[PDB]
Amino acid sequence: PRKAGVFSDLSNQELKAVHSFLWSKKELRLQPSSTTTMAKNTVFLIEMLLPKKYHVLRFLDKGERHPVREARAVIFFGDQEHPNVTEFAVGPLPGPCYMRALSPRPGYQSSWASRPISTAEYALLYHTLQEATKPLHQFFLNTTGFSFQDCHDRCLAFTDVAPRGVASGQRRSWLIIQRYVEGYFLHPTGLELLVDHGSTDAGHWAVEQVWYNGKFYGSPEELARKYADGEVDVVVLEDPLEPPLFSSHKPRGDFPSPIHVSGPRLVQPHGPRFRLEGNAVLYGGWSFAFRLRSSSGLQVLNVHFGGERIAYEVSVQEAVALYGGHTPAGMQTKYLDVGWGLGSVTHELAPGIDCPETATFLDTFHYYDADDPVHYPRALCLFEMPTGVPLRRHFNSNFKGGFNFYAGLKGQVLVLRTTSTVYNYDYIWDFIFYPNGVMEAKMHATGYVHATFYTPEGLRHGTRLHTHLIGNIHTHLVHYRVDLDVAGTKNSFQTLQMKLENITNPWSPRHRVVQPTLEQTQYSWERQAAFRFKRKLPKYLLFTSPQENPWGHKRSYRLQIHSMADQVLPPGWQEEQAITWARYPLAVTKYRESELCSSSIYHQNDPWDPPVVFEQFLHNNENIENEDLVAWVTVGFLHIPHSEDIPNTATPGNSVGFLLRPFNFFPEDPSLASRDTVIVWPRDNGPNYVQRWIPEDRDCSMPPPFSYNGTYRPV
């Protein structure tokens, strides 16, 4: 269990140790992230940097030494003539002595433009807007009752969309202006503004274009003028500030059948049945470690069942929302969430709501756009829950008014969960473990939709959800890395299909038997195992070991994809270079340390020329027979918003993911070791014998009272 520490995130202490070491190098001229100038040197991100798999596996499987522990440190070098972003690996931990180059990209010049936005930058943007929009002040008051200057409880706000321009190196953002009320995401005013904020001197920043209610205007002054001269068809918004605001979660309406009491709840009188210690988990047959990468999010590592490895890594790689729109902001929006620290917006899970009251809730620390490491309460939870459906059951009838036996095993699952709330949407990320060796990855979508100001032309790109509101059409796409090591590193990939044959009926020569047969297809090269959305995806996608089970069949795990995704952008066109993985519901690559990730934090702001292009992993078309393979999986769905998305998108029917299922891996059902199985047997002239291996439970316990903090701060 101490071995799982190799996969563990950095502690508050280690984050501080790395930050202090960076600050001790006076030549870096490092300033705090909150300093409100772009022309500064700052440490933007610090997170644990996984050691090489070769070394980890020798540590884990061969008794060799613990690999050196390091942190990734991303430094924004704004305080120089040619600003750039450079990454380092800082180590060792404990006792940092060195910073070495990490992911160097020599000859690329747009790193500064590619960098994530930051709190300091937002503050300066708000300053830029307050000055630049002064001509529109009276316009603001007349059309909205809110303002940017001299506001207190009636402030305008903005939401920036990305990417930021039409080509690599640009940092020109469209901004959707909204009223800052409860659920402000759903309150666009009809104004959108394009700001060039590329220069490290914010005094050079300019609103270069203005869109209001269907027309472009060139500058704030021009719109002000034309409005003053009565030449603008404006939409005067009603006052927002008894009934709840449409964008509030507050209850309204009544069901015809009143519900006055709390619903059923999980109790756990015996406590957890899994063993969670640090980042190590044991649960029946299962053994795995986890981590929460601040940049990209949740990972489960070194996953075993039955004491045998199944997967070295399963991890979220990227999550995107690709929009169409009638407004410039809407037609600009391709959100890539790793560009926003998908793994560090893991905000507090509410006990009894976000996870069961019986869950184990876990804190973490993140250092992402911060002056010090920040404590995130209840960032993750781990819990066992009844699925409501038995894992297996059978009624063995005697067909004479009775039975020979009933047998059943109550359905339970272990769930590891976190969330990501960057801004409007809340994604819920689950890794789920079933007692029979099946594991499942799942994303659910909830929170607020990305929405723009209603005009009639908007109906070609979305749905009217309220008086002044359009929910823009978009597609959610998530990419997963699935480094399966089925019973070991060396695997192959094959598929199975049903194929009909047409033979002479062997017992009636005058007749035919047209019937299913089992067809196996082997795959030798990466390109053969790169399935595009147009291609027919076989029903059995198997990752196999050369080892056979006792019945002569190769030991395999099957990948089963649950998705409504499709090709969204045209392959090869401009920003689509950022998301070439989204060409493939499944693609298989040969493992490589230079190919651990399909995305990065830089992809959002330079989608034209990003540091990783997944398609390039397929270029060399490597042999994949008896090799360390990585499966990569795209899942997602088209979301055409509808009125039921107000105030929030709901989770029912809004999840996607995949299952990993053993297929001839174990000699028989691996859940047979469960002692929860019950078999009822008849007895002549008596009550039935209920055979158990664990006593019947009716015990009771109570969860702690509900609490919720809502703050996240350094400790």
Add this chain to the structure above:
Amino acid sequence: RKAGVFSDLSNQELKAVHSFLWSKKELRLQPSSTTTMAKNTVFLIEMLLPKKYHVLRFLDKGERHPVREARAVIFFGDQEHPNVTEFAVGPLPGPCYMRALSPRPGYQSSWASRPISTAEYALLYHTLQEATKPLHQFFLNTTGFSFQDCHDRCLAFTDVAPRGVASGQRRSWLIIQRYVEGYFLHPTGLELLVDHGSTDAGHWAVEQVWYNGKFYGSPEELARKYADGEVDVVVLEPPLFSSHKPRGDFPSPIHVSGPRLVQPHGPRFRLEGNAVLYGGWSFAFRLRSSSGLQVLNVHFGGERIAYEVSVQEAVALYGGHTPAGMQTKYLDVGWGLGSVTHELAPGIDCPETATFLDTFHYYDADDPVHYPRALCLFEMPTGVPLRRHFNSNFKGGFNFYAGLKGQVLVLRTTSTVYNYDYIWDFIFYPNGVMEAKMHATGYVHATFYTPEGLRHGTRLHTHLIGNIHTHLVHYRVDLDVAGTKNSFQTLQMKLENITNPWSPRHRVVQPTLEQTQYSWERQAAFRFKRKLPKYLLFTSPQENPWGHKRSYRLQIHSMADQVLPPGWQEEQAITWARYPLAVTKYRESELCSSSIYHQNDPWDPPVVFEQFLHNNENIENEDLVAWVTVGFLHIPHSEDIPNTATPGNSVGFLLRPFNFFPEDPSLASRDTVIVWPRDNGPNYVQRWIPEDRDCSMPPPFSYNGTYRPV
């Protein structure tokens, strides 16, 4: 309750229909249990739904309760030309009449088409026992079991269907097995073809014999060749591999019970008879002995969504190396899918807190039979909030957290015809989303291992091949979105490529929303070849407050494909499986896509789904019916031993509100919690129901396992 119009027959009603028929002396009725085929007997009695026209006038326009009737299926075997005839028996209470249903002029295979029965099995077993006497020593030597003086070491058989090569035949292949715990997985290597068509069991014959990859013609021939050394024979306390009993050890053993649901404040749904209320939901349900579970007159927010959602048929289509294997196309409505609803075990099949419901079936029985805990109805936490949001202030704090705990209402039954157990769910979420689901578990259909079998399945044990097969299920989904008259429409994303309106030298290539209308049935019949649109909408002409048509969306969760070749022989029985989705104009002559007869005459069945589409009717502003196929290929694997498990082995569909309600319909729920910050104090936790931490105990576990007349 008006939902009584949809209710199944009570014990009293079943007895009343049976008594009435038995009082007609000219019918010459005898009990199902009488062990001759040359008898007249009432095979099945269940409630026969009135016409939708009359039901809606009763429900919606305050008119008379429709006439209540029973469907009665009579096997007329005691006549020169045996047949099956169905009757409408009514009225109820106090039956007077008996009216013949659905004639088929020119169809001659009625008797052959009829389901197998207990009495037919007793006669088959007698035939096998007699016909296999020459193989007695062969049986003992090769298996240690036999049919004679066998006691604890008896052979058994599993029949496959369909039963022959053409309409009118009744020639069944029988898989010989050792009768032990989980006998389904113990084939001996012997299969037997028996012609049992004549009403005189005296005429029944073993016409062919298959053993370990060779045909032998008769039991006598196999016996002689065995004696003469001319047969390649396979000669066949930890638990048996076919047993559920625990063995093996987890690396981290678990010794205590897992978490459980408690419901100290009682159910939050209201059940009165067959009528259910739950938050916004109102619906009725029935358990049709022939075809299985239905939900009817489904309402949310006082508005109708669907008149009927029902299981229509469930099939398992096999390939194989053995003749039984290559013969098997099971169609479970042919086995009374809805009357093998055996006892739900509290805590396992449904939560300990569930409401368990009994029912009565009259299917191949002498009297109506009580089935304890045949269905269950329960609310359970889903473990994922229906909605949640963390509204950050981006300065180390928050403006609010809002969340609604996930709960769902589940209505469940099962069907275990024999080896497999299907679990049938209809699931209702608080936001107006309903879901249908089937899960497969129980024992696989399996045959004797030879090397040749590996082309049609997987070796799962020493002597066992798990045959490859596809599961396909058909649902009838009579959506009545806000009313009877609807249209069908699909939406897709289509890209446009325009001049970037703020940078003219550049392009915007972006999503647009494309809407497709459908005017004729055939346009809305989607084959598995065709690309299925992402939005499948059934729409009312009514608009929501924002100008969009009020609709429900159908979202299918399936791995199905075309299995049999269209137009080829038995595929005639399952033409519906050509279509993941097809839409028809409502017709009283097309209430069902299958029947109890399809299994035993798949070549010339009484209902051919394809014919529903032949008139290619207008579906603009009509009473529409969606028909949905879901399923999956199952290539068996060793983890299916002793049973297939439910994780990942489920299919179904969702029905989702799409611009039907002005905003999220779950906003009426008082379970929502909002946490607000407070200046210089603790947070305000706003609730509309008090926090609850009460615990209580459920009923102690019990299980009966018998199903008898009352």
